[PDB]
Design a protein around this ligand. Sequence first.
Ligand SMILES: *[C@@H]1O[C@H](CO)[C@@H](O)[C@H](O)[C@H]1NC(C)=O
Lengths: 172, 171, 167, 109, 50
Amino acid sequence: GLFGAIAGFIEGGWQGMVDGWYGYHHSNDQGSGYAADKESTQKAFDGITNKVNSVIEKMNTQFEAVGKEFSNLERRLENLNKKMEDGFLDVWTYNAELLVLMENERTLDFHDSNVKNLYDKVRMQLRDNVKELGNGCFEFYHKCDDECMNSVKNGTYDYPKYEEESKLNRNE
Amino acid sequence: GLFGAIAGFIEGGWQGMVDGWYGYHHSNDQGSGYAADKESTQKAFDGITNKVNSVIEKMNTQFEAVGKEFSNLERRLENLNKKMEDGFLDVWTYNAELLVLMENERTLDFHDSNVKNLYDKVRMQLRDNVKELGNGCFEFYHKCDDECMNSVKNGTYDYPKYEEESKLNRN
Amino acid sequence: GLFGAIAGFIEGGWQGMVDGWYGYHHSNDQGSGYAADKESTQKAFDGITNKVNSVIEKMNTQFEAVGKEFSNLERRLENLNKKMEDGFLDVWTYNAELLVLMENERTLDFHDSNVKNLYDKVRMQLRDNVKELGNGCFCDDECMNSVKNGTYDYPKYEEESKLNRNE
Amino acid sequence: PGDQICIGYHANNSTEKVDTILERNVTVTHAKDILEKTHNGKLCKLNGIPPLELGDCSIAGWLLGNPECDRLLSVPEWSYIMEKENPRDGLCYPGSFNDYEELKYLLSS
Amino acid sequence: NCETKCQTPLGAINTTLPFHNVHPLTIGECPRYVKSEKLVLATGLRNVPQ
Ligand SMILES: *[C@@H]1O[C@H](CO)[C@@H](O)[C@H](O)[C@H]1NC(C)=O
């Protein structure tokens, strides 16, 4: 991508991830499951709706088309009219097409950056208690129950609690 | 936000940091110190001013509508005039506003990128003589003076000086 | 600049790197070697050519100028012709100028992000078998030329490099 | 523990909200209004030279010389003209002015 | 008894902003009229409290 997360170090996404746009896949001693993240999904939803609402509001019930008729000695004036309506037709088309292309691209990248930002947040939370596999997964140096997992997902990972255990497992 | 420094891993701002936009806070023995980076803040000022100057320089044409008056027998002409003035009006409104929206985004993202890049400059300079806590601070594995600090903030850090020392204190 | 690689942690360019835009420099025993990455440099080319083709294809929804003439008794009408043509002249100028600028900026950061993603690819590949110097630098003309096509057996060199690391 | 360096950015007391495409009401350190919405409400001179105040006279009323517009019999440079909407004093003797809107245009140069 | 370089029907204008929203019918050297209530340009960063 541009942030290199989507179709980058994380090669493809999860058809089993359905409850949101971004999130987790854990596999510990208890369970094994996909679970989407609340905050990053809501924030991106909030973002994109604001984006599309800010698209349907910027070209709105104004620039009109009264028709006009002209004689056969008003050929200049007739043309002048054509060139003006076509002119502004061309302009608004170009504006709309460009708008769509640009905002698309920025949308894609927005997701990309969003994902990375998630990975980076969990990463810099876990530190060296875990192993960076390079695939967008972390291999725990300790044991993480359906609880230590929930302590990661909501940004409440106690590093010092599992610090020494992961250490003893790491130097070995 | 997009680069995730601002309102991200560096959770909040520094109301005491007021000599610039970005910068440092060293907390050694000799003292503490909010102290702004020079290079990054300057470059960020130069970019932004360059930007708004490039915004006021883009919508500066003229002159008048020359203002015309029409008969009760030329009402298509009068409307054509009207349609073309409102027409241009709407175009220049959209253009001005969208430009505003877009360059606002890109501006905030620019600060974000700026901060991150800085933190990445410091991190890749220090290397493993420190603990990347991830609140946006570093914890040293050695003694860093108002002299070793004020050597990091100007790009110069003898890694293999403190290498063995920090390797020892690390283990 | 925005991604921090170009004129950033990779301080400067390589005037001998001339088989592509980006790429590597390996320096083991067997030799040295400026050697451009393929994938990333090809993908940049496609996206840049796709962009300028996408700019030439957007200002061709065009025109042929029918040029009118008016008496000394139709002056408002002449001005209305004038003002219209000048008005659209100004609009297409703006769009054109503005597009150039913005797509200039985005091209630059596109390269930046390209290079940084490359470096991040090699970095998350090697893992801790190397020193991440942070000048943008970090094995046979065979182990090298294995990394530069995405293939690197980490648990091969794992125990050897763990050894040489600690002494 | 640690000797320690930190990386951070400015914040302040600024309540100046701006908008972007993704967001609204976004509070920032530094902004710049680039759209003027204030005048004085007075009608002034312009590059020093004062406009031509027609008052209760129309352009014909002036150009012909309706006696109620006798002030206008001699007139210095103007920078622009201020004519009212339906000026009282125009064609005293009633009638018509041919191609008036084009004369009215000619005066604008 | 005043003075200006930009002149609306409703008032007169000193500014160096690149836009106004007063009246379209201006005379003299003026900023570009727009139908906007606001145009605010972010120059600084986000104000996030600690
Ligand atoms: C914000 O800070 C400035 C000084 O930098 C001060 O002048 C102002 O009073 C402060 N705002 C308020 C209302 O506290």
